Structure 1
């Protein structure tokens, strides 16, 4: 089922690239409509980035959660 190809890829994408800051914890994320938004940092590093005043690692990548547009 092509939807399964997409699901399996997102699982892999989420697993193999951790937080861009601590490089260990997985990234924060949210689902919106038919898209998975994967933020660049885990929540701990994102909260800390606010405290230290660095926006360098702020950002996200959105992914369509199904095979067919």
Structure 2
């Protein structure tokens, strides 16, 4: 089933690329109607970046949650 190919992919994408900053915690993320937005950092590193004044790692990547658009 094609939606499952998509879901296993998103499951893998999320598991193997941790927070770009601490390199260990997994990323923050939210559901965005029909997309999964994976943020670049976990919530702790993100809050921290604001406090330290660094916006270098700010961002996200959206993923369609279904096989067909």
- Sort the TM-score into its range (normalised by shorter chain): over 0.9
- Structure 1 stretches of 4+ with a deviation exceeding 6 A read none
Displacement of 1:16 in angstroms is 0.1
CA RMSD of aligned residues (A): 0.2
Which consecutive residues of structure 2, in runs of 5 or more, have no partner in the other structure? none
Displacement of 1:10 in angstroms is 0.1
Which consecutive residues of structure 1, in runs of 5 or more, have no partner in the other structure? none
Displacement of 1:49 in angstroms is 0.1
User: Which deviations, in whole Å up to 9, do the C-alpha atoms of 1:31-69 show, x marking residues without a partner?
Assistant: 011000000000000000000000000000000000000
Aligned length: 69
